[PDB]
From a paper:
Here we report near-atomic models built into cryo-EM structures of procapsid I, intermediate procapsid II which has partially released the SP, and the mature DNA-filled capsid from bacteriophage SPP1. The structures are T = 7 laevo icosahedra composed of 415 copies of the MCP gp13 (35.4 kDa), several hundred copies of SP gp11 (23.5 kDa) inside procapsids, 180 copies of gp12 in DNA-filled capsids, and a gp6-gp7 complex which forms the specialised portal vertex. The asymmetric units (ASUs) comprise seven SPP1 gp13 subunits: six in a hexon (subunits A to F) and one from the capsid penton (subunit G). Gp13 has the characteristic L-shape of capsid proteins of other tailed bacteriophages, with well-defined A and P domains, an extended N-terminus arm, and the E-loop.
The mature virion capsid (MVC) packed with DNA was reconstructed from images of the infectious SPP1 phage particles. The MVC has the same size and protein shell thickness as procapsid II. The opening is closed in the MVC state whose hexon is nearly flat and only 1 nm longer than in procapsid II. The overall fold of the 324 amino acids-long SPP1 gp13 in the MVC is similar to gp5 in the mature empty capsid of phage HK977 in spite of only 12% sequence identity. Subunits A to E remain nearly unchanged during transition from procapsid II to the MVC. The major structural change found in hexons of the mature capsids is the outward motion of the A loops, probably caused by DNA packaging inside the capsid, closing the central openings and creating the binding site for the gp12 trimeric auxiliary protein.
Numbering used by the authors:
A (entry chain F): 56 to 217
B (entry chain E): 2 to 55
C (entry chain E): 110 to 324
D (entry chain F): 272 to 324
């Protein structure tokens, strides 16, 4: 799919003894990918009649929710690709490695503002268990209390958490 | 043999154009500059053109 | 194409006007000791822009005050502000990210502000504090504000705009030196040097201060 | 089953792939995607961090 990038440029020094020059416009490209997948399974028979119930029935019953985790597996894969090792993306990533910095209360803000002007186009946050844990153990107030709050805490700051 | 995807010929597709918008939001408004006077208007409208007054 | 570009032309001039403005302010405060009373410098690697230096900038007009209203800003600056904004009381975490106002003062966030660079990867920020309302400018008019022509034997068509406007603070008096022309001046030349104020003391009304970002 | 998925977002590119199509899992992760917008409106960010001691 194509697109037309918007115009930009100087005005000029409107002046005699000289004329102006017009200017131009550009265009651009975009792609996508189609992918396709599937699998299968089976059973014996003798086993079915000898076992007291029907395997095919059960597995058929479970088949539905199976595809979910596959789709997810694809998604994480593809994101991992997008941000992989491409300097073109550096502006959208952040790294706390090298053994200093804890993920608390600040670095989160940096990540939030890593889009400088536009903001609040961010809504929900990905998470892992132990992370949310450490969050909680720093969440304990000194005021108030031991102990009242708390364990699970959606939201975090005005943002969904999953 | 097969029908063999090497054979029936696959088309391609297109859709119309869509205007991109370059974004660096330009405001720094409202502030100085604002608030036109009548005097710089006395610079503005002809006659008695530039250069600029005092 | 002509349809599209014609459709977009309108909002274009904005960023140009802005480009002029930052240029001209940069000129006004440029390298002129006559202005020293309205500026402040935190350079030399100590001082973070927090909570105090801001107060100094606020009172840099000694008696008259509260003629300041809105604050210029850059993203990362507002960020560091936030990360120092976190209370110990209360809480982790409830507040917060975006915070207009700051102290009884409007705040305007923009990504494009003068940012210089030294060696040792040390960034420096500007963040004009004006609260003026305002400096001044007037529209003015040309003749032939818009026109369209074409090359008949080749295949082309064109658009043109050519608008006038007049802008300046009063404010410093403008001076005539070191300029070709004329008129107008230029971009670079409009920034070059040689403006001379007369009031002086107050009622300009703008102040800038340079500061390093929080470690 | 078939399905089609991608961000727009970065433009997809053709390199270093057998096929075709689809790509693969590993190959879909391998390398060589090239964005064009750029600046904003992607919209996603990741950051890696060590857990609290």
């Amino acid at each position: 799919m194509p697109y037309w990038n918007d115009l930009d440029g100087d005005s000029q020094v409107l002046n005699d003894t000289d004329d102006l020059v017009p200017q131009k416009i550009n265009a651009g490209q975009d792609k996508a990918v189609l992918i396709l997948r599937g699998n299968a399974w089976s059973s014996h028979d003798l086993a079915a009649t000898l076992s007291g119930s029907d395997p095919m029935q059960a597995i058929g019953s479970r088949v539905a929710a199976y595809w979910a985790r596959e789709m997810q597996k694809i998604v994480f894969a593809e994101l991992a690709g997008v941000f992989s090792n491409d300097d073109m993306k550096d502006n959208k990533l952040d790294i706390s490695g090298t053994a200093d910095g804890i993920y608390s209360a600040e670095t989160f803000v940096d990540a939030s503002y890593k889009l400088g002007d536009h903001e609040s186009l961010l809504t929900a946050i990905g998470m892992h268990s132990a992370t949310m844990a450490s969050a909680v153990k720093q969440d304990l107030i000194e005021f108030v209390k031991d102990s009242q709050s708390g364990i699970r805490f959606p939201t975090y700051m005005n943002k969904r958490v999953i | 043999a097969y029908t063999k995807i090497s054979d029936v010929i696959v088309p391609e597709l297109f859709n119309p154009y869509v205007i991109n918008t370059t974004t660096q939001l330009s405001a720094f408004f409202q502030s100085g500059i604002a608030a036109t006077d009548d005097e710089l208007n006395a610079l503005a409208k002809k006659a008695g053109g530039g250069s600029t007054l005092n | 194409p002509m349809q599209a570009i014609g459709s977009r032309v309108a909002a274009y001039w904005a960023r140009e006007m802005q480009k002029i403005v930052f240029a001209e302010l940069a000129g006004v405060f440029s390298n002129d000791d006559m202005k020293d009373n309205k500026l402040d410098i935190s350079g030399t690697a100590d001082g973070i822009y927090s909570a105090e230096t801001f107060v100094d900038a606020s009172y840099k007009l000694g008696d008259h005050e509260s003629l300041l209203t809105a604050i210029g800003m850059h993203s990362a600056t507002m960020a560091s502000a936030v990360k120092q904004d976190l209370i110990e009381f209360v809480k982790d975490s409830q507040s917060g990210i975006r915070f207009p106002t700051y102290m009884n003062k409007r705040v305007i966030v923009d990504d494009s502000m003068p940012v210089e660079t030294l060696e040792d990867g040390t960034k420096v920020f500007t963040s004009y504090l004006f609260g003026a309302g305002a400096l001044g400018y007037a529209e003015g008019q040309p003749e032939v504000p818009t026109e369209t022509a074409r090359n008949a034997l080749g295949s082309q068509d064109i658009l043109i705009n050519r608008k006038h406007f007049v802008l300046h603070p009063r404010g410093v008096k403008f001076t005539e030196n070191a300029m070709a022309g004329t008129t107008p001046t230029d971009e670079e030349l409009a920034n070059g040097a040689n403006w001379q104020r007369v009031y002086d003391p107050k009622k300009i009304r703008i102040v800038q201060f340079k500061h390093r970002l929080q470690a």
